[PDB]
Design a protein around this nucleic acid. Structure first.
Ligand SMILES: Nc1ncnc2c1ncn2[C@@H]1O[C@H](COP(=O)(O)OP(=O)(O)NP(=O)(O)O)[C@@H](O)[C@H]1O
Ligand SMILES: Nc1ncnc2c1ncn2[C@@H]1O[C@H](COP(=O)(O)OP(=O)(O)NP(=O)(O)O)[C@@H](O)[C@H]1O
Lengths: 466, 466
RNA sequence: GCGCCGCUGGUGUAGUGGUAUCAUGCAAGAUUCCCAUUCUUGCGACCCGGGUUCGAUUCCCGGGCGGCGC
RNA sequence: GCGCCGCUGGUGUAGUGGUAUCAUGCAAGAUUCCCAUUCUUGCGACCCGGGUUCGAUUCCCGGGCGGCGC
């Protein structure tokens, strides 16, 4: 609830700073520091594993420059003296004007033919694109909530309009979500907690494709740690072809984070009629159709124009909501604020910490660091004048998921055992430094929870050496 | 050597297509398809693991828009009627002009204070940035070699000018590299194959920092599969403060791929004098200095201006060189071209293949797919009218590292054994489908080579069922 | 940039002032049963516009893009 | 955008027409020896420019940026 506090923490530690502060900044442009960049990357990687990996989506890398004709066709050029897109010129100035793309989606549309081709002309397939987009907003505001350059992650799901049904829907059908349907909106009611499947077999949500995507969108948002309770999907009123967008409860109110938008025969077609190049899938007929025109003209393939589900992920806003949702303040010392980053998307998975500024602590810190690096675990080595707890508070601020402390009992006892300390709970268990990185991986990957670790291992009574 | 062939393959299969081909394209702008995007991502991930992970570098996410004052200070604005940067306007047009950044480096410079701060004010530290950059080239050409929007990956290494020596240099000191020093250039000679260490303790390369970075740059380029033989580091003549850039032998000649440039007191300072904000590290004195001025003014900290090593990685050109270097054509059927993508950066690590369009092959294809996905291995399921070999040739084109074929002996024998087939060699071994994904991971991660697999497992004599 | 020749299925090409050849490739059914098998069948293209024209993919003017010369 | 109040170490602030208070934080040495210990010491700032002025962080004009009203 305390954005003053949260923000102070985020700024002091360079999660994200205002861009070009040195030159007195610029509105709506923000640079992400080390910790924020680590978090952002983790979120993105998680998104790739949760969507691209899970659905065999075809990620592509289109460019951010986009010539005026393209956006005329799309209807952005007309959608706005001056207009809300960054306008520039390509080449020797003059006759080829252009813009910085307002969304990553269009690239997937002007490549539909080669993408379908790659999918052996078959349907239904999905192609995605993660990348930055630029709106030249008159009044940017609210930190990351409305900026001028942000990172989108879009998925275009091309599916035969007829075959709108999903094989894997049963994997999300039994989820309990908050749904803010259109009726409930105009009928003055709040959102409702439905089992997903039911919401589909009550016609609230058209089909099991839309449903499926909603379910996994939900699962993803909660995976990275957006509170389930401050997350609803709000159907679009008489305001879309059938949008349903995921919003979160922030201090700036309910905010759009992911826009899942089922457009039918839309962008593709406008592009086709523009360029005169046809964009279509062909589906074989299972019963060929002789058409006696006047001779007999037999048809073997129906010329399908696919429907498209367009989930647009706002990385910026999702990141911010992970902030506001996972920002806590400790009992007692209220100077110690922490970030309950879910383990898998933590900026740093571990912290190598000695007990005190002592020399006989060096080799275990070095060897642990190197061993975590071998094991590929992102870690912060912190070793200063600071008391153990100062370093704890320093590491908790940036939401380091767990913390290894190497101590005297680690040095002065035969099985070299150091301690692992859980961020959120502050509690700790003791294990041999030889296997610790494995525990930290296993932790960072959900296969074991902290409860799992507390179970499998001795707790921590005390320390007996000096 | 055959760029007609190579290119045909790259284009047909949408590694990268010319941008906005539908609207008749645009020069110097290229979109990367599924396979190219997969490869690109793999390269980037490998770069992060090889540099950021290995050196605790501080990756940040700066923006691509950059106001005119910044680039005036940097001296890009002056560096060129019209000039070679994409110019746009930020906000209500008018009085705040700007550009699309010509490099990602500057962001790391205008944030130096917070980055140093994060590093506890200590030296020497490194911060990186992966991201796109834009040159408005008059004549873009040669596919990816010279474009208008590309992906850079830059590292700024800030180090005290005095303490220019590297603890880990002994890890690269014993490498054998091709060095094209300045003398050899003006003295009409070719490059020379030196042991790295020697080249440093002969003064050819100033110091062991520069050296270290050269060594790991080399290791990285060869990791992703640039031929060692078509790779040299060319020192800058009387042409830099001490540049040494890695170039590769392509069909377009020797091309710059990575620009490692040791600038001294350069960018930081110009920025500081511009904004009047000081950019400096402080180093404690180990013997305080009382300075009798006229009273006694004791100094405890010397005000250091760090030197900066600037390796600039050209993702585009590196990608292209991986293409030209790893593009082969099979013995016999010269329609079958393949890509010897090193296992770790392959676009797809595996291919689930049945033997023929048969029904009793389905469940093993599905279960294998799902099992690889569980095991997080990027794979292509290919199951068509096609003969086994047509699918082989189809999968070899895109450089799928290995290929599982499920057959009759897999179905009609008690331990369910399918075959693993090595791309480059076409040879194959047989293992139970229950443990196959582990072998494919282990393969994709260097811990086991193909020789390792051929050793640990039975070969492949034949198939006995139908 | 400027100069030179160019553009026809996804790819490689034939050809023409009355809307198109062959190969490949992709799809379907068979046929295969470990390395682009084979037969049948199906899908798919004249870069964009302007000019002249009854009519242009063809001829001419202009843009786009590519192969190359500095 | 327009309107409103604002800007001083990294962060939070005091104050003034003669260049700066306190807290924090970061650093060093000690002191601790498992949760911002304590003492000493050190580092670091008036958003930018213009005007008036002997002189501006202070006063005024203009830009930048932020907190908010539509
Ligand atoms: N100025 C901005 N700052 C940060 N994120 C933005 C900004 N503008 C758009 N987005 C993101 O872009 C996504 C979709 O863009 P947008 O077109 O506005 O929504 P949509 O899917 O078209 N329909 P809707 O979101 O209801 O307008 C949203 O989910 C946002 O998270
Ligand atoms: N038009 C381009 N297309 C693709 N890559 C480019 C292009 N321009 C620059 N690069 C990449 O950018 C990197 C460095 O840019 P550049 O400034 O030209 O070199 P550098 O490190 O400054 N010194 P030098 O490369 O010798 O000019 C190179 O390694 C290239 O790979």
């Amino acid at each position: 609830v305390d954005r003053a506090k949260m923000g102070d923490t985020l700024k002091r530690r360079f999660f994200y700073d205002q861009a070009f502060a040195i030159y007195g900044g610029v509105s709506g442009l923000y640079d992400f520091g080390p910790v924020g960049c680590a978090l952002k990357n983790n979120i993105i990687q998680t998104w790739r594993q949760h969507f691209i990996q899970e659905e065999q989506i075809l990620e592509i890398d289109c460019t951010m420059l986009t010539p005026e004709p393209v956006l005329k066709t799309s209807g952005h050029v007309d959608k706005f003296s001056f207009n809300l897109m960054f306008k520039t010129f390509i080449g020797p100035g003059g006759n080829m004007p252009g813009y910085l793309r307002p969304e990553t989606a269009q690239g997937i549309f002007l490549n539909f033919k080669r993408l379908l081709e790659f999918n052996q002309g078959k349907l239904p397939f999905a192609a995605a694109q993660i990348g930055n987009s630029f709106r030249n907003e008159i009044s940017p505001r609210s930190g990351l909530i409305r900026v001028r350059e942000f990172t989108m992650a879009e998925i275009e799901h091309f599916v035969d309009p007829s075959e709108k049904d999903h094989p894997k829907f049963q994997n999300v059908a039994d989820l309990h979500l908050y749904l803010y349907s259109a009726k409930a909106q105009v009928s003055g009611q709040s959102a409702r907690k439905m089992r997903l499947g039911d919401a589909v077999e009550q016609g609230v949500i058209n089909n099991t494709v839309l449903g499926y995507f909603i379910g996994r969108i939900y699962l993803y948002l909660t995976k990275v740690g957006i509170s389930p309770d401050k997350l609803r999907f709000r159907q679009h009123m008489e305001n879309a072809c059938d949008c349903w967008d995921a919003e979160s409860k922030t201090s700036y109110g309910w905010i759009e984070i992911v826009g899942c938008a089922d457009r039918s025969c839309y962008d593709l077609s406008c592009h086709a009629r523009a360029t005169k190049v046809p964009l279509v899938a062909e589906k074989p007929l299972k019963e060929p159709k002789t058409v006696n025109v006047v001779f007999q003209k037999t048809l073997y393939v129906e010329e399908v124009v696919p429907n498209v589900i367009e989930p647009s992920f706002g990385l910026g806003r999702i990141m911010y909501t992970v902030f506001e949702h996972t920002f806590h303040v400790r009992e007692g010392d209220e100077q110690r604020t922490f970030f309950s980053f879910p383990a898998v998307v933590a900026p740093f998975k571990c912290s190598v910490l000695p007990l005190s500024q002592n020399q006989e602590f060096m080799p275990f810190v070095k060897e642990l660091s190197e061993a975590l690096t071998r094991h590929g675990v992102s870690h912060k080595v912190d070793d200063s004048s600071g008391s153990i707890g100062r370093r704890y508070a320093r590491t908790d601020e940036i939401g380091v998921a767990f913390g290894v402390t190497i101590d005297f009992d680690t040095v002065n006892k035969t099985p070299h055992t150091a301690t692992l300390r859980d961020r959120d709970s502050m509690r700790q268990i003791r294990a041999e430094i030889s296997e610790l990185p494995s525990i930290v991986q296993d932790l960072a990957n959900g296969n074991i929870t902290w409860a799992d670790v507390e179970a499998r291992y001795p707790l921590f009574e005390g320390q007996e050496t000096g």
